[PDB]
Amino acid sequence: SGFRKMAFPSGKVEGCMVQVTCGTTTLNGLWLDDVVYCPRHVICTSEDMLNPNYEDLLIRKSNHNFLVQAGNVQLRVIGHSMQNCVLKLKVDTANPKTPKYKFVRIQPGQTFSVLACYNGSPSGVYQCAMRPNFTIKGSFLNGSCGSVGFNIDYDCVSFCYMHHMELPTGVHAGTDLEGNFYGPFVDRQTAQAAGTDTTITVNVLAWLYAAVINGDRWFLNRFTTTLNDFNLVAMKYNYEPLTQDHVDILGPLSAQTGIAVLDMCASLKELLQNGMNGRTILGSALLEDEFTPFDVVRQCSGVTFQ
Amino acid sequence: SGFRKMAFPSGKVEGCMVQVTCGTTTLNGLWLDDVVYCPRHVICTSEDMLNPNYEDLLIRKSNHNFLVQAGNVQLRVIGHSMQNCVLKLKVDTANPKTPKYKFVRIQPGQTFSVLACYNGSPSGVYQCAMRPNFTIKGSFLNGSCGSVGFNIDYDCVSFCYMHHMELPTGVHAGTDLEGNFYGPFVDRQTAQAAGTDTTITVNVLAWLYAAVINGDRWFLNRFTTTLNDFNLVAMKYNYEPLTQDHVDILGPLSAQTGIAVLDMCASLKELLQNGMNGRTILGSALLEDEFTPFDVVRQCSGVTFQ
Ligand SMILES: *[C@@H](CC(=O)OCC)[C@H](C[C@@H]1CCNC1=O)NC(=O)[C@H](CC(C)C)NC(=O)[C@@H](NC(=O)OCc1ccccc1)[C@@H](C)OC(C)(C)C
Ligand SMILES: *[C@@H](CC(=O)OCC)[C@H](C[C@@H]1CCNC1=O)NC(=O)[C@H](CC(C)C)NC(=O)[C@@H](NC(=O)OCc1ccccc1)[C@@H](C)OC(C)(C)C
Numbered sequence: 001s002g003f004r005k006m007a008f009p010s011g012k013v014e015g016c017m018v019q020v021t022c023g024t025t026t027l028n029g030l031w032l033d034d035v036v037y038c039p040r041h042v043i044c045t046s047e048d049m050l051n052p053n054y055e056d057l058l059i060r061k062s063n064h065n066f067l068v069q070a071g072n073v074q075l076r077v078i079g080h081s082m083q084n085c086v087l088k089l090k091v092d093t094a095n096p097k098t099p100k101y102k103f104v105r106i107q108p109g110q111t112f113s114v115l116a117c118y119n120g121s122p123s124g125v126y127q128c129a130m131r132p133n134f135t136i137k138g139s140f141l142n143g144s145c146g147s148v149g150f151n152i153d154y155d156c157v158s159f160c161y162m163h164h165m166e167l168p169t170g171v172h173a174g175t176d177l178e179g180n181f182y183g184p185f186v187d188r189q190t191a192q193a194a195g196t197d198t199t200i201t202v203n204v205l206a207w208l209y210a211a212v213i214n215g216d217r218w219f220l221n222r223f224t225t226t227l228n229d230f231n232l233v234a235m236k237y238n239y240e241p242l243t244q245d246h247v248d249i250l251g252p253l254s255a256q257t258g259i260a261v262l263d264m265c266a267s268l269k270e271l272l273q274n275g276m277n278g279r280t281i282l283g284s285a286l287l288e289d290e291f292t293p294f295d296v297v298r299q300c301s302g303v304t305f306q
Numbered sequence: 307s308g309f310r311k312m313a314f315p316s317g318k319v320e321g322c323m324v325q326v327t328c329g330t331t332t333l334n335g336l337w338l339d340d341v342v343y344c345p346r347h348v349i350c351t352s353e354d355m356l357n358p359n360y361e362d363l364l365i366r367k368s369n370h371n372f373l374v375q376a377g378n379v380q381l382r383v384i385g386h387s388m389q390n391c392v393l394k395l396k397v398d399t400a401n402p403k404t405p406k407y408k409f410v411r412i413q414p415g416q417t418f419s420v421l422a423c424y425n426g427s428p429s430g431v432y433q434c435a436m437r438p439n440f441t442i443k444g445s446f447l448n449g450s451c452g453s454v455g456f457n458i459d460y461d462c463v464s465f466c467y468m469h470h471m472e473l474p475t476g477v478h479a480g481t482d483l484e485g486n487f488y489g490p491f492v493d494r495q496t497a498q499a500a501g502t503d504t505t506i507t508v509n510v511l512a513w514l515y516a517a518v519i520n521g522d523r524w525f526l527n528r529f530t531t532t533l534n535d536f537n538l539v540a541m542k543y544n545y546e547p548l549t550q551d552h553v554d555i556l557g558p559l560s561a562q563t564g565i566a567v568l569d570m571c572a573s574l575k576e577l578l579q580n581g582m583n584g585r586t587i588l589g590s591a592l593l594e595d596e597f598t599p600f601d602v603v604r605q606c607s608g609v610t611f612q
Contacts, residue, residue, distance in 0.1 A: 001445075001447075001472060001476040002443060002444050002445035002477075004432040004434075004444065006422070006430035006431065006445060007313060007432070008430065009317070009421065009428040009429070010315045010431065011315070011316060011320040011321065115315065116312070122315040124604075124605065125316065126311060126312045128310075137589065139308035139312060141307075142607075166307060170307040170308060172308065214476065280592075283443065284591075285590075285591035286586075298430075299430065301447050301448075
């Protein structure tokens with residue numbers, strides 16, 4: 001039993017991290033087969049921060065203007081190209097520890113593991129969700145750009161995030177591994193701001209089911225609700241609407257606990273209208289929304305503590 | 307910026323996990339050089355759960371009664387010995403991915419990363435503290451025994467925990483890597499219970515400093531306190547006493563923020579007496595006590611958001 005914010009084991013990704021240097025700028029790259037992926041702002045200077053023209057900056061570079069370092073060996077760049085906001089460096093050496101991998105672009109509300117890296121060296125791993133406003137509440141300092149987010153499925157690593165920037169509220173923004181930003185952000189230091197965020201309703205519900213599976217029932221009640229009436233309450237507390245698709249996704253958790261999805265919605269409505277009254281749920285004093293239904297099934301026992 | 311429960315990268319430990327089988331019982335082992343470490347209760351039967359005599363059970367075994375599996379290769383046991391509550395299996399093959407490592411026994415209030423494993427296969431990583439009552443609030447199911455907890459320092463892995471058992475309240479108990487239990491627990495299914503726990507005061511204070519470093523000051527106040535008067539309040543809220551050693555450990559965080567340790571103690575006292583009043587600190591609605599001062603320094607920027 002127990003329930004923890006659980007990252008995937010990071011070893012398959014640690015073997016892919018390198019250091020990329022252009023000019024005097026250094027950040028992290030992702031080395032897969034004979035290509036190194038990294039944020040294109042590594043070709044910026046201190047002056048090209050406000051409105052850089054990256055196509056113009058890039059045509060001014062040669063292959064030998066880039067330095068790639070894997071551990072304590074240098075990799076020679078033998079070709080380069082820009083793809084959206086990522087740079088791809090073709091290197092003379094295929095990464096021997098390349099895992100089975102995919103590039104995936106995730107939907108808001110999906111979670112992933114982040115391997116924070118500095119100077120090509122992994123420093124930590126934590127679990128993140130893509131917020132509805134397409135930011136992540138990460139932990140990133142200078143030098144962290146090029147750190148990647150990923151999920152792991154049967155030894156296949158699905159890379160879904162590369163880190164590019166921090167917003168004024170302290171949340172983080174970046175791209176898929178093809179260099180497309182999540183959300184409306186761009187990789188320049190012009191005024192940008194995270195939109196208003198909302199709570200990921202389907203994940204709160206999954207997490208309440210986790211709490212039931214682990215033996216805690218105190219927040220349940222005898223009431224039910226309709227999908228429409230729930231969403232009227234959801235809107236009022238800045239929760240995302242719950243769709244029939246979300247209802248169907250919660251199916252297995254409903255079945256293992258015997259609690260119908262809309263019965264758990266009436267529990268959540270009561271928690272929203274009344275608070276927790278000094279109580280905790282799975283050790284938390286607020287409603288957690290960064291566990292997907294898949295995260296709950298992955299970590300919880302398949303037999304509920306009846 | 308940001309602040310997350312951050313585990314160490316787990317790759318160096320993933321390379322050491324194997325599956326150990328004796329009879330029909332299977333659990334996880336730690337493969338370092340030519341020795342596999344695993345909990346001795348792998349030699350138990352369904353009948354030898356209440357009061358097993360492990361010396362008696364073990365003399366009845368041969369080397370060929372143990373099966374060690376690393377990935378999809380079998381390792382042959384060429385020798386065995388019991389050390390406290392761990393079994394050591396000498397194997398014919400030295401682990402080629404053995405990292406630089408140490409065995410360390412940690413004090414209560416220290417944190418570590420846990421690589422949860424099932425059948426020798428890593429499944430997740432999360433961050434734990436050794437509670438003052440020598441339990442950890444982990445996430446462990448059947449099959450998880452032999453999973454290990456560790457810290458990483460300059461590519462040296464310090465193993466500090468091996469998982470053995472769950473207590474009725476859902477918290478977890480285990481040993482150092484020499485097989486000595488943390489706390490008064492024993493590896494048999496006789497009635498045992500976690501003692502009353504207390505909050506790790508020095509860690510709460512470190513975490514308040516993290517919040518200051520990341521730009522949040524709302525909970526500070528103009529007051530100070532003496533060490534003695536703080537601890538009188540600490541006792542009242544089931545917090546551990548703060549020692550002069552704890553004061554000195556918080557030194558660097560005090561210096562980076564300009565907030566004297568005893569001034570932050572007067573802030574904590576106010577938070578304890580008044581609550582948060584609907585506010586959060588680093589996104590949390592309760593006072594977090596599973597970040598050591600060292601954890602804060604490791605993750606936070608060295609320059610405070612003034
Ligand atoms: C990765 C590379 C790096 O370290 O470069 C250092 C010079 C960083 C990761 C950041 C740094 C701190 N935490 C992080 O996650 N990314 C960057 O430095 C970004 C480079 C841009 C060219 C994309 N810049 C920022 O992250 C920047 N944000 C930003 O400018 O947003 C646009 C903006 C919003 C409001 C007002 C003006 C501009 C950060 C560094 O600036 C602050 C003030 C928002 C923190
Ligand atoms: C690891 C090996 C395993 O899976 O064996 C399965 C048969 C597990 C890890 C546990 C299982 C669930 N979550 C975990 O972390 N360890 C064990 O099964 C332990 C083997 C003993 C021989 C040490 N047993 C327990 O963990 C057991 N606790 C226990 O008996 O504590 C003593 C006790 C306390 C009060 C009353 C009676 C006995 C668990 C499985 O039992 C419960 C009821 C406390 C959950």
